[PDB]
Amino acid sequence: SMEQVAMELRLTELTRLLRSVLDQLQDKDPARIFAQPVSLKEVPDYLDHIKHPMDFATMRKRLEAQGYKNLHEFEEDFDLIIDNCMKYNARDTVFYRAAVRLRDQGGVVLRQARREVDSIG
């Protein structure tokens, strides 16, 4: 059907918008603390602490498989990256502080993205 192609053109454009948003969020992590999954070889107890690990590379795989249906889904994954880090690492650590900064800075990008997803449709 034609509608299915229209829908897919919308999913495709959203994917285009989310890719740009993802790139902008990742630029706010110049240290690359959030680039890849936490290593279970190097943090073998990690899953005792964190039930749903997330990281920018895992978000990118989903993105390119058009696995985000809406912005809310994408934001959930971004908030996991932040929230997991602030639970696992203590307040006084480089890791926790990087998550605070990513959160604050990411907020501006996400605010405009929401207006663009609404505005474009």
CB atoms within 10 A of CB 119: 8
CA gap 62, 86 in Å, rounded: 23
Q: Residue 53 corresponds to which amino acid?
A: P
Give domain limits for the chain.
1-121
Q: Residue 82 corresponds to which amino acid?
A: I
- What's the CATH architecture for 1-121? Up-down Bundle (1.20)
CA gap 14, 98 in Å, rounded: 28
Resolution (A): 1.9
Name the burial class of residue 18, with classes exposed (0-12), middle (13-18) and buried (19+) by CB atoms within 10 angstroms of its CB: buried
